[PDB]
């Protein structure tokens, strides 16, 4: 049995989250239990609900029951979840899972879909060069960078010199600020002699905003 | 969670580790206990089902059992590749719900300590021309993965405008974090020196930048 989730990457608070799981290689109305599970970033697994294929019986997390619907569709061989009145507390990776009722050595999981709940609107980042100081320039190597400030939503990718520069590159995970917007930095350490002879450009791509900036790092 | 498991467990390579899950007669007492291994945010892997059965393909270093209202996962011959989060899962008849434990993070001891490398960047001229100023403190290659970051302006504690990430693990098994001090043009110019102070394993590397 294989499972594939689908759902929105980004949602606004108070909306209704709706998820579907396409099931293949077994019958949705066979002797299975079909579950939804979620994991908020950096937190534990949290089971949400189950629907049994044979009976149609459903059961729910006590703390989520008042806001969740779980359903199945035999013609579509799928099952689904609705969670209403979302808040940021519902930001999580949502997994569909399943198990035979009797052959419990089998365990099926989708790969999960990240759902981010935020009031923020899509915004491309401003890119600022992080130039080394000349005290760092007196060392043998120097750190050169680019700040990717105030974007939403994730993700952003950074490369250097169109991917031709890979050694000594470190791109850091983003911070989330009280404003709802992310920032991150990418640094590259290079020989300090190279600083007059080599051009350094960081290529920042934010596909949610259709924004792609190639920032030259001078001095 | 009505199931309690320790938040963390640690042992040396080769040792036997036990992870326990404590519940009630309504869940662990009468229902099937399962144990899952997970890297965070990705699908967990079933290690044990029906409280004491191992699925095909799982190493026989993993075993499980339960007794009364408690259940245990045992890992013999601990390897560094066993570092992961471990969850018990069980049905609760009285809640009519499936419950995961809060998770146990397994650390394999003995890995060599590594001090953080720290890089502090002042605001760019382009950001200052927008009347904003962001100091960027980048912290990498430290182990174990816990750090404390403090900002100082002319020797005094800055506690407005700082945002710091949690540590995250690099490709070389060490850790990385970053901290951001967001100011305006005027504040950045208001001070002699700014300092990023990174405390690790009891000791501190700080960094300074000046307008």
């Amino acid at each position: 049995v294989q499972l594939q989730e689908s759902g929105p990457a980004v949602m606004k608070p108070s909306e209704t989250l709706s998820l579907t799981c396409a099931v293949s290689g077994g019958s949705i109305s066979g002797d299975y239990g079909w579950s939804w599970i979620r994991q908020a970033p950096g937190k534990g697994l949290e089971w949400i609900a189950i629907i049994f294929g044979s009976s149609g019986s459903t059961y729910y997390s006590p703390s989520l029951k008042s806001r969740v619907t779980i359903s199945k569709d035999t013609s579509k061989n799928q099952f689904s979840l609705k969670l209403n009145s979302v808040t940021a507390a519902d930001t999580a990776v949502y997994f569909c899972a399943g198990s035979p009722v009797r052959q419990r050595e089998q365990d099926y999981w989708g790969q999960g879909v990240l759902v981010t709940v935020s009031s923020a609107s899509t915004k491309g980042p401003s890119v600022f060069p992080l130039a080394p100081s000349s005290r760092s320039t007196s060392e043998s190597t120097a750190a050169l960078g680019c700040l990717v400030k105030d974007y939403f939503p994730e993700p952003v990718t950074v490369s250097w010199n169109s991917g031709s520069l890979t050694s000594g590159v470190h791109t850091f995970p983003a911070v989330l600020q009280s404003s709802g917007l992310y920032s991150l930095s990418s640094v590259v350490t290079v020989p300090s002699s190279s600083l007059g002879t080599q051009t350094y450009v960081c290529n920042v791509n934010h596909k949610p905003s259709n924004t792609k900036v190639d920032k030259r790092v001078e001095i | 969670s009505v199931l309690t498991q320790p938040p963390s467990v640690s042992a040396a390579p080769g040792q036997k580790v036990t992870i326990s899950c404590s519940g009630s007669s309504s869940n662990i007492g009468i229902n099937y206990v399962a144990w899952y291994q997970q890297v965070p945010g990705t699908a967990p892997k079933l290690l044990i089902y029906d409280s004491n059965k191992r699925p095909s393909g799982v190493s026989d270093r993993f075993s499980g059992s339960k007794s009364g209202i408690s259940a245990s996962l045992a890992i013999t011959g601990l390897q560094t590749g066993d570092e992961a989060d471990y969850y018990c899962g069980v049905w609760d008849t009285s809640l009519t719900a499936y419950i995961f434990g809060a998770g146990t993070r397994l650390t394999v001891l003995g890995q060599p300590k590594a001090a953080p490398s720290v890089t502090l960047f002042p605001p760019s001229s382009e950001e200052l021309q927008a009347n904003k100023a962001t100091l960027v403190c980048l912290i990498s290659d430290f182990y174990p993965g816990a750090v404390e970051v403090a900002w100082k302006a002319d020797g005094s504690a800055v506690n407005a405008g700082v945002e710091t990430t949690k540590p995250s693990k690099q490709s070389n098994n060490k850790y990385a974090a970053s901290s951001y001090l967001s100011l305006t043009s005027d504040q950045w110019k208001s001070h002699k020196s700014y300092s990023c102070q990174v405390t690790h394993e009891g000791s501190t590397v700080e960094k300074t930048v000046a307008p």
């Binding site: 239990g33 | 399962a34 079933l46 008849t93």
Partner: peptide
């Protein structure tokens, strides 16, 4: 295994 109990 996931989701499946013995006693309802």
């Amino acid at each position: 295994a996931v989701g499946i109990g013995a006693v309802f």
